[PDB]
Amino acid sequence: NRLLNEKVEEFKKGVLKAGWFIEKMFRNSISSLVERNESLAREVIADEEVVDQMEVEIQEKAMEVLGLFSPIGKPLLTVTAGIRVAELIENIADKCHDIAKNVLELMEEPPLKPLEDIPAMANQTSEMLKFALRMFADVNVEKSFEVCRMDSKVDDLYEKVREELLLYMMESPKYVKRALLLLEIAGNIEIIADYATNIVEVSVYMVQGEAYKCYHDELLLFKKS
Ligand SMILES: O=[P-]([O-])[O-]
Ligand SMILES: O=[P-]([O-])[O-]
Ligand SMILES: [Ca+2]
Ligand SMILES: [Fe+3]
Ligand SMILES: [Fe+3]
Ligand SMILES: [Fe+3]
Ligand SMILES: [Fe+3]
Ligand SMILES: [Fe+3]
Ligand SMILES: [Fe+3]
Ligand SMILES: [Fe+3]
Ligand code: NI
Helix, strand or coil, X not given: CCXXXXXXXXXXXXXXXXXXXXXXXXXHHHHHHHHCCHHHHHHHHHHHHHHHHHHHHHHHHHHHHHHHHCCCCHHHHHHHHHHHHHHHHHHHHHHHHHHHHHHHHHCCCCCCCCCCHHHHHHHHHHHXXXXXXXXXXXXXXXXXXXXXXXXXXXXXXXXXXXXHHHHHHHHCHHHHHHHHHHHHHHHHHHHHHHHHHHHHHHHHHHHHCCCEEEECCEEEXXXXX
């Protein structure tokens, strides 16, 4: 009668497992950079196609649940929220794939410099990813606010890294390619962090049936015309 609940809970756990999968992908992409591990980068590139599949499966299951049970209210919100989260997860995987591509290219020549700010960007981003997936599993609107502040740390680091790498590019032509490849990695981390904030926003909607958005440190009701 309400084995609707069994199927919705399984759908949600599928989405969360694909989440835990990209959480590991992002970890592995940044590890391929710091350890200069060609194989690990190649695994991330391969794993991107696994996540394309996961998106297809999530979408299939959402249709099965919607089409058989025709849910309303909370279960309907959860399923549509799952549809949206699975695209965010797939896109995060695209960005991890692109970081890994950059790692392979970086490995063609010697290390440019010590890595501090990029590892720190990644660390903050992986905290945000973990937190987003935990909000999707069990939403706390009062605490979900914290993701926005976390993102501001990633934005500030990105700006620093961008300025520093521009200086390296200008110092010598031999620094240019590595500095660009590193800058592009930083940019991909910054976007992944944005996606983590979007997972929190969608998770809040999933309970509220009303749109919230990060506005720099503040999670507000979508304040627009
Ligand atoms: O598989 P494509 O959306 O990156
Ligand atoms: O913090 P967002 O505007 O990239
Ligand atoms: Ca290149
Ligand atoms: Fe079952
Ligand atoms: Fe997609
Ligand atoms: Fe995509
Ligand atoms: Fe993809
Ligand atoms: Fe931000
Ligand atoms: Fe951004
Ligand atoms: Fe950002
Ligand atoms: Ni693909």
